């Protein structure tokens, strides 16, 4: 006897998949270039798989479950023995100021939640609730000004002070939409359109 409870919306969608690879680096003590804080606006329109799966429907209400996998490497033969990097991962909610410097107030501001991650431990994890003005996301908008739903931004930097090692790092972000509802089915877009 079969089930059919594997084609459910949550079962179809609630699959984690990398959405971006944010590159940062600990500046060398020579200060050749300042911190490369990585800022990425949360959007599903860069992953073909998630976007295509979401374009089967017009309106959706899905809660995000971001997760961060942190990796790093020395760029020089000399070890330098940099003590384990500490990464600040700040979730700038929708509408809040976007950081423009590695020392901007937005990092220290009270509103923006932040996670502190010591390279080596279990991956960081948050769960952005359904954050939207309307009562359901919209992937297709037939109106005009006077889609592009704002989920927020993620800004990641290295709290540690400069060290002469040039420790580059690449945070992979995995998004698992949970508690997802979808309305108004639509034709699926071809795989060449993206």
Partner 1 sequence: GLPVMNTPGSNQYLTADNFQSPCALPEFDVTPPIDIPGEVKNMMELAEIDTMIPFDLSATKKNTMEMYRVRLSDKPHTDDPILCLSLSPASDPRLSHTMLGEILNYYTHWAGSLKFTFMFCGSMMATGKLLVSYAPPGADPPKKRKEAMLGTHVIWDIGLQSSCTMVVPWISNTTYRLTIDDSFTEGGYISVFYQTRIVVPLSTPREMDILGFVSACNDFSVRLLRDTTHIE
Partner 2 sequence: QLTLGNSTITAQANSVVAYGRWPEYLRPTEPEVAACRFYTLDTVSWTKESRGWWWKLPDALRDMGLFGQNMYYHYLGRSGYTVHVQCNASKFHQGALGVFAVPEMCLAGTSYQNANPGEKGGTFTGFCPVDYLLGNGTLLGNAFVFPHQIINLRTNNCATLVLPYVNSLSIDSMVKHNNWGIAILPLAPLNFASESSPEIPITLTIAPMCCEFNGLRNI
CA 1 – CA 167 distance, rounded (Å): 55
Residue 108, phi then psi, degrees to nearest 5: -90, -5
Report CA 101 to chain centroid distance, whole Å.
Answer: 19
Q: Which stretch binds partner 2 (CB under 8 A): 22-30, 46-54, 75-83, 184-192?
A: 184-192
How many residues sit in the footprint of partner 2 (CB under 8 A)?
Answer: 22
Q: Are 27 and 162 in contact (CB under 8 A)?
A: yes
Sole binder of partner 2 in the list 48, 86, 98, 184 (CB under 8 A):
184
Integer Cα distance of 157 and 152 in angstroms? 17
Cβ distance to a copy of itself smaller for residue 116 or 183: 116
Binding flag, residue 111, partner 2 (CB under 8 A): no
CA–CA gap between residue 27 and residue 34 (Å, rounded): 6
Q: CB under 8 A: which stretch of 14-22, 37-45, 118-126, 134-142 binds partner 2?
A: 134-142
Residues that bind a copy of itself (CB under 8 A): 15-18, 29, 49-50, 53, 69, 71-75, 77-84, 86, 108-111, 116, 118-121, 123, 159-164, 167-168, 170, 172
């Amino acid at each position: 006897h079969r089930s059919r409870s594997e084609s459910s919306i949550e079962s179809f969608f609630a699959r984690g998949a990398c959405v971006t690879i944010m590159t940062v680096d600990n500046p060398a003590s020579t200060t050749n270039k300042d911190k490369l804080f990585a800022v990425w606006k949360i959007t599903y329109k860069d992953t073909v798989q998630l976007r295509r799966k979401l374009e089967f429907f017009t309106y959706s209400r899905f809660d995000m479950e971001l997760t961060f996998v942190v990796t790093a490497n020395f760029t020089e033969t000399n070890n330098g023995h940099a003590l384990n990097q500490v990464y600040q991962i700040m979730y700038v909610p929708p509408g809040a100021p976007v950081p423009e410097k590695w020392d901007d107030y937005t990092w220290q501001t009270s509103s923006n939640p932040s996670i502190f991650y010591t390279y080596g431990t279990a991956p960081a994890r948050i769960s952005v609730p359904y954050v939207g003005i309307s009562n359901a996301y919209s992937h297709f908008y037939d109106g005009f000004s006077k889609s592009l739903n704002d989920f927020g931004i993620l800004a990641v930097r290295v709290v540690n002070d400069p060290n002469p090692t040039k420790v580059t790092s690449k945070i992979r972000v995995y998004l698992k939409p949970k508690h997802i509802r979808v309305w108004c089915p639509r034709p699926p877009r071809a795989v060449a359109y993206y």
